[PDB]
Amino acid sequence: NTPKDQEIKKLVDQNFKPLLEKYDVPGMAVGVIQNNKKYEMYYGLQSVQDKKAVNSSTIFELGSVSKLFTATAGGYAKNKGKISFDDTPGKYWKELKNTPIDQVNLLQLATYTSGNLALQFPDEVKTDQQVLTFFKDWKPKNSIGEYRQYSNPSIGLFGKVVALSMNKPFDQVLEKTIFPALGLKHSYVNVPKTQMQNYAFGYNQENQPIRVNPGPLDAPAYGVKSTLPDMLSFIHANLNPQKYPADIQRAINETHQGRYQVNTMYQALGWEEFSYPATLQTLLDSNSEQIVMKPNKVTAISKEPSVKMYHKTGSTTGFGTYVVFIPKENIGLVMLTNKRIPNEERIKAAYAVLNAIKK
Numbered sequence: 001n002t003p004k005d006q007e008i009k010k011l012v013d014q015n016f017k018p019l020l021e022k023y024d025v026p027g028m029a030v031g032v033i034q035n036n037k038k039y040e041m042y043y044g045l046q047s048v049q050d051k052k053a054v055n056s057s058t059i060f061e062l063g064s065v066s067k068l069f070t071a072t073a074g075g076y077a078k079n080k081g082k083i084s085f086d087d088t089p090g091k092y093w094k095e096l097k098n099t100p101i102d103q104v105n106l107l108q109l110a111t112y113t114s115g116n117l118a119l120q121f122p123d124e125v126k127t128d129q130q131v132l133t134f135f136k137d138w139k140p141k142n143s144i145g146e147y148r149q150y151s152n153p154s155i156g157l158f159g160k161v162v163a164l165s166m167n168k169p170f171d172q173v174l175e176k177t178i179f180p181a182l183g184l185k186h187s188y189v190n191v192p193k194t195q196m197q198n199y200a201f202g203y204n205q206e207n208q209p210i211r212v213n214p215g216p217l218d219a220p221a222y223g224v225k226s227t228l229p230d231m232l233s234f235i236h237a238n239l240n241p242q243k244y245p246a247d248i249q250r251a252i253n254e255t256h257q258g259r260y261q262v263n264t265m266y267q268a269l270g271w272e273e274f275s276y277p278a279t280l281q282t283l284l285d286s287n288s289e290q291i292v293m294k295p296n297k298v299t300a301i302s303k304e305p306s307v308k309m310y311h312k313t314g315s316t317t318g319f320g321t322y323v324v325f326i327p328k329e330n331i332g333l334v335m336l337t338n339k340r341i342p343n344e345e346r347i348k349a350a351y352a353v354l355n356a357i358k359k
């Protein structure tokens with residue numbers, strides 16, 4: 001119950017708690033890490049029917065914040081020499097050798113610039129064989145590397161290749177190598193039986209309990225579930241990579257490097273990157289329909305900002321996630337909800353908290 005405890009509680013109550021009523025959200029976890037200390041705020045219920053409160057054990061679906069762990073895995077393999085970002089996917093998924101998609105390099109897959117991969121796989125692509133056929137039948141549309149189109153199949157293929165280069169399934173890459181390296185104890189691609197009691201239900205617009213369904217390359221694109229304490233540890237690792245062993249430290253740093261620019265947004269690996277201080281409008285623009293849903297011409301980076309901040313939104317059918325951190329301020333914030341709320345609301349509430357907090 002320190003002054004800082006009470007300040008952050010007030011700030012989160014002022015800016016995040018009203019969203020519970022506005023959007024009829026059953027449960028929420030909001031955490032701030034500042035000065036290497038975690039402040040955790042919990043609201044409502046992880047399970048309505050069970051009257052089980054959200055707490056530090058509650059497991060939430062991260063949605064596209066999962067892409068940050070896929071990016072980290074990629075940075076890990078790259079800096080161990082298992083892959084080069086200049087490689088093409090057929091070097092590792094041999095069935096793609098000598099197909100058109102084998103002209104796209106791993107960095108372009110990871111940062112969504114293949115020129116012909118949409119937000120989602122086609123509805124009809126479900127089985128492993130259908131995914132393989134999808135990529136074997138793939139052909140270019142836009143000039144490769146020139147257009148960013150935010151895409152699950154794109155970074156999902158990147159993650160599959162990362163896993164192949166490590167001779168392990170993607171779920172094991174994260175659960176056996178990446179999560180332990182980051183110090184995470186309750187982060188999962190597949191929640192085990194002994195943790196199902198901690199796995200929140202998500203809630204749709206009818207307030208029915210739902211969880212993410214299986215989908216093609218789901219694990220690298222949107223398949224991670226985690227707790228508020230683990231996500232604050234992940235933010236700590238991004239704030240303080242020098243404190244971690246070389247292999248994961250290099251991976252974390254690798255994910256921070258901007259690869260190209262779209263207006264005021266720099267695309268890093270998984271993370272979106274901005275010059276800091278960033279305006280609220282800049283952060284909102286990054287999640288506009290134009291940026292999220294449409295192709296945008298990229299521009300090569302002339303000068304990466306010397307002072308930066310990073311964020312990422314994530315959603316599943318039943319869950320919302322937002323993460324943000326600012327190295328120069330040694331501060332970050334995580335929001336987890338078990339009902340989707342508009343991305344702009346997540347960005348606005350986090351902006352108000354991080355800019356009002358005493359430094």
Ligand SMILES: *[B@@-]1(O)O[C@H](CNS(=O)(=O)c2ccc(Cl)cc2)c2ccccc21
Pocket residue numbers: 063064065119152221222287288289292293313314315316343
């Ligand atoms: B992942 O969380 O990001 C994408 C897109 N998410 S979304 O909620 O469909 C969305 C967000 C903003 C706009 Cl402007 C449009 C749409 C995604 C897609 C499927 C699964 C996981 C994720």
Ligand SMILES: [Cl-]
Pocket residue numbers: 063064313314315343
């Ligand atoms: Cl999202």
Ligand code: NA
Pocket residue numbers: 119120121152153215216221
């Ligand atoms: Na998809």
